[PDB]
């Protein structure tokens, strides 16, 4: 009655290609404490924050332990993932075998095959058999379940928790329009009847990307060259005037000249939220917007916001779940790599890191 | 019976050297409505906002009218000044002949010899005879009264209206430490028992400037080179550590690398207020301060803040007046040019614009 599991670990910080390895360890399913549960991993993605943890340049990080049976202290990898309950202890009533779960806290370590925890280390999601038996037209896919805990909540909370946009009338503007968060924000804008402008990098297949973002819910899509153009400012003013509303909110994950351009398109009393910085350039705002247009620039970090606010986390997650079940929200598809034991587990994640430019990478089990 | 007055006007926006002229006009002191008052100018300064109004790049400006008897609509110049009451109408009880007043609102037009207005177009200040009769050790000078409505209120409100610093413990930091507003903030910080760091440009007589700013009330003084040096950066953290407080507020009037440097020195949850800028330097903030340190950057514009808030303006002005009377506040000295009628009035102000880099220019009467 011993389960053999695999985990991706490191003994020292550095680049994933250099420091990651796979460790085998054992879990005893015949001797669970009353509140313990055992889970098997169904899938977990490679997110940028996971990589920064390994590099040692992220301010929140799991402790190095000898608990996986290593020769030296070693840390696990990954914060997001979808798990299935295999067995529960005698006092567990909130979970049963077959339930789908995600970690309730950060630093769980999701790049591995199995885990042992307490029942309150997890949040329950409905699995497809449960959604179907209760008459829902859809159930969660593995990719949808494995990525539900961050990017959908980021987009929802940025759009609803800070400024009240008037339906049909008001606008938000965002850069990184082809990012995962950007695509969730376009869909949520459409569902809540918010107008939006998406700014994106130009590309060889621009017409196809534009059509795809408008189908998700972007009202208009413009290139970074158009974002930089001062002669374009009157066209955008006329979009906003025709709707009878105002551009009240800007979402920035790029920085530099892109952040300047979307800040200039807000009406007076506008707010910018910076939630990423993929350009690695600082946020750059002209003095005149602060002084004469009452502009405010602030930050967003979902981990900090939800730290001591679990009603808000619960209520936001329930809404994302309901929209997936009703067929109203869709995920950006990941490139999936299945672990079948012929290739060491850490090499699949090393490939996921290296190929992240191709798109979101999900390792499945 | 009839007073002949002079006013500096323009019919079109542009550079003061090109568009200003002087217009003669008449005021009838025998025909006052019950609430009208006649005032005579004592002095009015040349501020940067006054020049930008004339240039057409400042969004708050007086309307062009034919009220001075011009062939075309014309606008007056200047927003602050000190006046003496000459005569009041039959229903005026708040003012009497000999009182000192400032305009109650912006866009009044202070580059002129005389004005006719309503009693509520003016705010009374005590004149030196009244301060002396009230037992105060000092009375206001003309320079103090003529410049009291902008720079002292800017410094006071930025320090008290936005974040609450704990007296004796907490810190603010500012750049442009030798500017007029910067020198007022050091003195007000000292009166409120706030600690402060002033960042200044390096200069030949640095030790003398540092001693002088510390005597005004700055706790520590550093150069821009030291602000940018991370080797120097551990010293600043220990200053704050030793005081048992936190750096909570940054005041920015420079932009660019300087704004980055003072932002990096705030503790978590800090606020930056931008109230001025340098030609081409946008405000530049690292992405990581927004996301991981809960940093917020906002603007300050005294004209907009006090637009519809006369209670706040009144209580702030009363405190600045009391501090001058009690000897607790000192002004920077202006270069004063007297109008005696041999040279047209608009030319005195044109010279004041051209020489503003020598120091604050005050035209007196
Ligand atoms: N603060 C928070 O709470 C929080 C939480 C989770 C994630 N995030 C942040 O949100 C961002 C997106 O995460 P994600 O999962 O959505 O990633 P993602 O889907 O893989 O997309 C990354 C985005 O960055 C853009 N990008 C990459 N390099 C760029 C450059 N040099 N200049 C401009 N744009 C560039 C990409 O655009 P192209 O398609 O044009 O290449 C893409 O839109 C990340 O910065 C992440 O750190 C923040
Ligand atoms: Na500017
Ligand atoms: Na100055
Ligand atoms: Na940064």
Tab-separated table of C-alpha atoms in Angstrom, chain B residues 4-310:
chain	number	residue	atom	x	y	z
B	4	UNK	CA	-7.550	106.029	-14.998
B	5	UNK	CA	-5.982	102.550	-14.726
B	6	UNK	CA	-3.578	100.341	-16.726
B	7	UNK	CA	-3.845	96.620	-17.526
B	8	UNK	CA	-1.555	94.116	-19.284
B	9	UNK	CA	-3.611	92.229	-21.917
B	10	UNK	CA	-3.342	90.027	-24.991
B	11	UNK	CA	-5.716	89.301	-27.888
B	12	UNK	CA	-4.049	85.998	-28.922
B	13	UNK	CA	-1.981	83.338	-27.176
B	14	UNK	CA	1.765	83.249	-27.711
B	15	UNK	CA	5.071	84.162	-26.134
B	16	UNK	CA	4.790	87.142	-23.722
B	17	UNK	CA	7.551	88.989	-25.610
B	18	UNK	CA	5.316	88.953	-28.726
B	19	UNK	CA	1.640	89.243	-27.638
B	20	UNK	CA	1.438	91.502	-24.544
B	21	UNK	CA	0.309	95.136	-24.567
B	22	UNK	CA	-0.933	97.768	-22.067
B	23	UNK	CA	-4.501	99.094	-22.117
B	24	UNK	CA	-5.751	102.246	-20.381
B	25	UNK	CA	-9.233	102.103	-18.852
B	26	UNK	CA	-11.463	104.066	-16.484
B	27	UNK	CA	-13.137	103.256	-13.151
B	28	UNK	CA	-15.882	105.502	-11.740
B	29	UNK	CA	-15.477	105.708	-7.960
B	30	UNK	CA	-18.658	107.779	-7.499
B	31	UNK	CA	-20.954	105.074	-8.956
B	32	UNK	CA	-20.447	101.907	-6.885
B	33	UNK	CA	-23.133	99.274	-6.597
B	34	UNK	CA	-23.928	98.326	-2.983
B	35	UNK	CA	-21.568	95.295	-3.013
B	36	UNK	CA	-18.767	96.621	-5.260
B	37	UNK	CA	-15.246	97.518	-4.091
B	38	UNK	CA	-12.324	99.346	-5.710
B	39	UNK	CA	-8.768	98.134	-5.019
B	40	UNK	CA	-5.292	99.352	-5.946
B	41	UNK	CA	-2.475	96.870	-6.629
B	42	UNK	CA	0.521	96.726	-4.247
B	43	UNK	CA	2.477	93.953	-5.970
B	44	UNK	CA	2.026	90.884	-8.176
B	45	UNK	CA	4.641	88.271	-9.141
B	46	UNK	CA	5.563	86.431	-12.330
B	47	UNK	CA	4.854	82.716	-11.849
B	48	UNK	CA	5.395	79.886	-14.372
B	49	UNK	CA	1.644	79.200	-14.488
B	50	UNK	CA	1.050	82.840	-15.528
B	51	UNK	CA	3.414	82.460	-18.489
B	52	UNK	CA	1.928	79.130	-19.587
B	53	UNK	CA	-1.562	80.719	-19.559
B	54	UNK	CA	-0.369	83.429	-21.956
B	55	UNK	CA	1.300	80.785	-24.146
B	56	UNK	CA	-1.977	78.839	-24.376
B	57	UNK	CA	-0.727	75.560	-22.870
B	58	UNK	CA	-2.363	75.863	-19.404
B	59	UNK	CA	-5.993	74.593	-19.212
B	60	UNK	CA	-7.301	77.208	-16.705
B	61	UNK	CA	-7.427	80.739	-18.116
B	62	UNK	CA	-9.525	83.928	-18.020
B	63	UNK	CA	-12.007	84.566	-20.784
B	64	UNK	CA	-11.258	87.129	-23.479
B	65	UNK	CA	-13.722	90.020	-23.125
B	66	UNK	CA	-14.231	93.598	-24.272
B	67	UNK	CA	-14.509	94.780	-20.670
B	68	UNK	CA	-11.349	96.930	-20.822
B	69	UNK	CA	-12.765	98.784	-23.839
B	70	UNK	CA	-10.698	97.043	-26.537
B	71	UNK	CA	-11.564	96.733	-30.233
B	72	UNK	CA	-11.217	92.934	-29.954
B	73	UNK	CA	-11.793	90.520	-27.065
B	74	UNK	CA	-8.738	90.530	-24.805
B	75	UNK	CA	-7.636	88.561	-21.770
B	76	UNK	CA	-5.824	89.897	-18.661
B	77	UNK	CA	-2.743	88.311	-17.075
B	78	UNK	CA	-1.693	87.023	-13.658
B	79	UNK	CA	-3.393	84.970	-10.950
B	80	UNK	CA	-1.935	86.132	-7.637
B	81	UNK	CA	-1.329	89.548	-6.134
B	82	UNK	CA	-1.749	91.809	-3.121
B	83	UNK	CA	-4.159	94.773	-3.268
B	84	UNK	CA	-5.267	97.644	-1.051
B	85	UNK	CA	-8.957	98.567	-0.709
B	86	UNK	CA	-9.653	102.158	-1.809
B	87	UNK	CA	-13.469	102.416	-1.551
B	88	UNK	CA	-16.491	100.182	-0.845
B	89	UNK	CA	-20.205	100.360	-1.641
B	90	UNK	CA	-23.046	100.994	0.754
B	91	UNK	CA	-23.718	97.334	1.640
B	92	UNK	CA	-20.089	96.180	2.126
B	93	UNK	CA	-19.252	95.262	5.710
B	94	UNK	CA	-16.470	92.663	5.296
B	95	UNK	CA	-13.928	95.175	3.911
B	96	UNK	CA	-13.066	98.824	4.514
B	97	UNK	CA	-10.661	101.381	3.055
B	98	UNK	CA	-7.049	100.446	3.873
B	99	UNK	CA	-7.577	96.682	4.172
B	100	UNK	CA	-5.208	94.282	2.431
B	101	UNK	CA	-6.777	91.656	0.138
B	102	UNK	CA	-5.938	88.895	-2.332
B	103	UNK	CA	-8.278	87.547	-5.011
B	104	UNK	CA	-10.555	84.792	-3.813
B	105	UNK	CA	-10.363	82.955	-7.179
B	106	UNK	CA	-7.864	82.317	-9.972
B	107	UNK	CA	-8.069	83.969	-13.403
B	108	UNK	CA	-8.756	87.416	-11.894
B	109	UNK	CA	-5.968	89.257	-13.722
B	110	UNK	CA	-3.398	90.786	-11.357
B	111	UNK	CA	-0.951	92.449	-13.801
B	112	UNK	CA	-2.593	95.877	-13.594
B	113	UNK	CA	-2.780	99.012	-11.435
B	114	UNK	CA	-6.396	98.932	-10.164
B	115	UNK	CA	-9.498	96.763	-10.180
B	116	UNK	CA	-13.235	96.988	-9.588
B	117	UNK	CA	-14.973	93.925	-8.152
B	118	UNK	CA	-17.488	92.513	-5.694
B	119	UNK	CA	-16.556	92.089	-2.047
B	120	UNK	CA	-16.618	88.292	-2.411
B	121	UNK	CA	-14.011	88.475	-5.183
B	122	UNK	CA	-11.438	89.158	-2.409
B	123	UNK	CA	-10.052	87.529	0.744
B	124	UNK	CA	-8.877	89.810	3.549
B	125	UNK	CA	-5.344	89.542	4.998
B	126	UNK	CA	-4.264	91.546	8.072
B	127	UNK	CA	-2.157	94.573	7.255
B	128	UNK	CA	0.858	95.451	9.410
B	129	UNK	CA	-1.040	97.973	11.557
B	130	UNK	CA	-3.708	95.353	12.306
B	131	UNK	CA	-1.158	92.623	13.128
B	132	UNK	CA	0.561	95.056	15.503
B	133	UNK	CA	-2.682	96.036	17.200
B	134	UNK	CA	-3.395	92.325	17.724
B	135	UNK	CA	-0.078	91.992	19.615
B	136	UNK	CA	1.723	89.915	16.959
B	137	UNK	CA	5.561	90.202	16.804
B	138	UNK	CA	5.561	90.624	12.992
B	139	UNK	CA	3.348	91.898	10.218
B	140	UNK	CA	3.269	90.635	6.632
B	141	UNK	CA	5.548	92.165	4.023
B	142	UNK	CA	4.298	92.972	0.520
B	143	UNK	CA	6.237	90.053	-0.949
B	144	UNK	CA	4.721	87.693	1.630
B	145	UNK	CA	1.151	88.831	0.861
B	146	UNK	CA	1.615	88.868	-2.930
B	147	UNK	CA	2.941	85.263	-3.098
B	148	UNK	CA	0.852	83.695	-0.317
B	149	UNK	CA	-1.808	82.080	-2.518
B	150	UNK	CA	0.229	79.475	-4.449
B	151	UNK	CA	3.564	78.107	-3.237
B	152	UNK	CA	2.902	78.049	0.564
B	153	UNK	CA	-0.494	76.360	0.090
B	154	UNK	CA	0.974	73.782	-2.329
B	155	UNK	CA	3.538	72.691	0.260
B	156	UNK	CA	1.066	72.639	3.163
B	157	UNK	CA	-1.645	70.646	1.397
B	158	UNK	CA	0.677	68.012	-0.122
B	159	UNK	CA	2.029	67.290	3.370
B	160	UNK	CA	-1.312	67.162	5.239
B	161	UNK	CA	-4.209	66.351	2.864
B	162	UNK	CA	-3.247	62.897	1.478
B	163	UNK	CA	-1.364	60.611	3.898
B	164	UNK	CA	-1.099	60.981	7.679
B	165	UNK	CA	2.518	60.975	8.862
B	166	UNK	CA	2.998	60.123	12.535
B	167	UNK	CA	4.732	63.120	14.192
B	168	UNK	CA	8.200	62.379	15.510
B	169	UNK	CA	8.510	59.132	13.496
B	170	UNK	CA	7.531	59.148	9.814
B	171	UNK	CA	9.347	60.623	6.789
B	172	UNK	CA	8.737	62.335	3.491
B	173	UNK	CA	11.225	62.738	0.654
B	174	UNK	CA	11.316	65.380	-2.068
B	175	UNK	CA	13.360	66.451	-5.069
B	176	UNK	CA	13.867	70.059	-6.179
B	177	UNK	CA	14.942	70.697	-2.602
B	178	UNK	CA	16.143	74.270	-3.274
B	179	UNK	CA	12.919	75.349	-5.074
B	180	UNK	CA	10.446	77.745	-3.464
B	181	UNK	CA	7.953	74.960	-2.719
B	182	UNK	CA	10.746	72.680	-1.520
B	183	UNK	CA	11.929	75.282	0.972
B	184	UNK	CA	8.390	75.799	2.282
B	185	UNK	CA	7.963	72.020	2.701
B	186	UNK	CA	11.136	71.753	4.786
B	187	UNK	CA	9.905	74.494	7.140
B	188	UNK	CA	6.376	73.103	7.401
B	189	UNK	CA	7.752	69.600	7.931
B	190	UNK	CA	9.715	70.984	10.873
B	191	UNK	CA	6.656	72.727	12.336
B	192	UNK	CA	4.605	69.527	12.030
B	193	UNK	CA	7.466	67.427	13.464
B	194	UNK	CA	7.892	65.293	10.328
B	195	UNK	CA	11.307	63.974	9.311
B	196	UNK	CA	12.407	64.650	5.756
B	197	UNK	CA	15.054	64.035	3.119
B	198	UNK	CA	15.690	66.710	0.497
B	199	UNK	CA	17.320	65.702	-2.793
B	200	UNK	CA	19.143	68.543	-4.596
B	201	UNK	CA	21.484	69.089	-7.519
B	202	UNK	CA	25.203	69.221	-6.718
B	203	UNK	CA	26.762	72.707	-6.768
B	204	UNK	CA	30.001	74.501	-5.801
B	205	UNK	CA	28.922	75.733	-2.350
B	206	UNK	CA	27.293	72.469	-1.348
B	207	UNK	CA	28.198	72.475	2.356
B	208	UNK	CA	26.685	75.956	2.765
B	209	UNK	CA	23.470	74.980	0.945
B	210	UNK	CA	23.131	71.795	3.015
B	211	UNK	CA	23.561	73.694	6.298
B	212	UNK	CA	21.027	76.296	5.147
B	213	UNK	CA	18.382	73.681	4.217
B	214	UNK	CA	18.879	71.829	7.515
B	215	UNK	CA	18.358	75.132	9.351
B	216	UNK	CA	15.051	75.527	7.465
B	217	UNK	CA	13.999	72.074	8.661
B	218	UNK	CA	15.244	69.292	6.412
B	219	UNK	CA	16.490	66.336	8.481
B	220	UNK	CA	18.948	65.100	5.838
B	221	UNK	CA	20.100	66.434	2.462
B	222	UNK	CA	21.524	64.383	-0.418
B	223	UNK	CA	22.555	65.100	-3.997
B	224	UNK	CA	21.011	63.574	-7.119
B	225	UNK	CA	24.237	61.585	-7.619
B	226	UNK	CA	23.814	60.041	-4.158
B	227	UNK	CA	20.079	59.450	-4.830
B	228	UNK	CA	21.115	57.366	-7.860
B	229	UNK	CA	23.955	55.479	-6.104
B	230	UNK	CA	22.943	52.121	-4.666
B	231	UNK	CA	26.204	52.009	-2.706
B	232	UNK	CA	24.902	55.082	-0.854
B	233	UNK	CA	21.482	53.438	-0.463
B	234	UNK	CA	22.068	51.499	2.780
B	235	UNK	CA	22.699	54.714	4.723
B	236	UNK	CA	19.179	55.968	3.991
B	237	UNK	CA	17.483	52.776	5.218
B	238	UNK	CA	19.327	53.096	8.538
B	239	UNK	CA	18.247	56.719	9.015
B	240	UNK	CA	14.651	55.540	8.757
B	241	UNK	CA	15.324	52.479	10.905
B	242	UNK	CA	16.828	54.560	13.725
B	243	UNK	CA	13.779	56.852	13.899
B	244	UNK	CA	11.274	54.019	14.386
B	245	UNK	CA	9.072	55.369	11.556
B	246	UNK	CA	8.602	54.877	7.796
B	247	UNK	CA	9.052	56.789	4.551
B	248	UNK	CA	5.428	57.183	3.401
B	249	UNK	CA	5.301	60.127	0.967
B	250	UNK	CA	7.389	61.318	-1.985
B	251	UNK	CA	7.058	64.768	-3.601
B	252	UNK	CA	8.173	64.965	-7.231
B	253	UNK	CA	8.678	68.108	-9.312
B	254	UNK	CA	11.492	66.806	-11.579
B	255	UNK	CA	10.567	63.538	-13.287
B	256	UNK	CA	12.887	61.055	-14.967
B	257	UNK	CA	15.680	59.346	-13.051
B	258	UNK	CA	15.127	61.604	-10.061
B	259	UNK	CA	11.520	60.426	-9.718
B	260	UNK	CA	12.724	56.802	-9.889
B	261	UNK	CA	15.293	57.425	-7.164
B	262	UNK	CA	12.977	58.954	-4.574
B	263	UNK	CA	10.257	56.336	-5.281
B	264	UNK	CA	12.664	53.507	-4.503
B	265	UNK	CA	13.248	54.903	-1.015
B	266	UNK	CA	9.671	54.664	0.260
B	267	UNK	CA	8.565	51.801	2.491
B	268	UNK	CA	5.736	49.519	1.326
B	269	UNK	CA	2.391	51.272	0.633
B	270	UNK	CA	4.024	54.578	-0.307
B	271	UNK	CA	2.458	57.487	-2.198
B	272	UNK	CA	4.148	59.824	-4.680
B	273	UNK	CA	2.596	63.178	-5.622
B	274	UNK	CA	3.780	64.861	-8.828
B	275	UNK	CA	3.246	68.646	-8.815
B	276	UNK	CA	5.819	69.805	-11.415
B	277	UNK	CA	8.097	68.560	-14.153
B	278	UNK	CA	11.146	69.158	-16.328
B	279	UNK	CA	10.497	69.775	-20.050
B	280	UNK	CA	10.970	66.242	-21.431
B	281	UNK	CA	11.197	64.071	-18.302
B	282	UNK	CA	8.158	61.799	-17.796
B	283	UNK	CA	7.567	60.158	-14.436
B	284	UNK	CA	9.433	56.826	-14.534
B	285	UNK	CA	8.625	54.123	-11.951
B	286	UNK	CA	9.900	50.505	-11.916
B	287	UNK	CA	7.130	47.954	-12.488
B	288	UNK	CA	8.169	46.092	-9.318
B	289	UNK	CA	7.311	48.948	-6.924
B	290	UNK	CA	3.698	48.918	-8.143
B	291	UNK	CA	3.218	45.141	-7.983
B	292	UNK	CA	5.284	44.036	-4.983
B	293	UNK	CA	5.468	47.158	-2.780
B	294	UNK	CA	1.920	48.507	-3.289
B	295	UNK	CA	3.215	51.864	-4.594
B	296	UNK	CA	0.782	54.563	-5.831
B	297	UNK	CA	1.634	57.589	-7.997
B	298	UNK	CA	-0.805	60.524	-8.296
B	299	UNK	CA	-0.892	64.211	-9.214
B	300	UNK	CA	-1.313	67.502	-7.380
B	301	UNK	CA	-2.765	70.760	-8.758
B	302	UNK	CA	-3.755	73.385	-6.195
B	303	UNK	CA	-5.982	75.222	-8.689
B	304	UNK	CA	-8.192	72.159	-9.197
B	305	UNK	CA	-8.184	70.990	-5.540
B	306	UNK	CA	-9.370	74.349	-4.168
B	307	UNK	CA	-11.763	75.148	-7.056
B	308	UNK	CA	-14.954	74.312	-5.145
B	309	UNK	CA	-13.525	74.059	-1.582
B	310	UNK	CA	-13.399	77.482	0.041
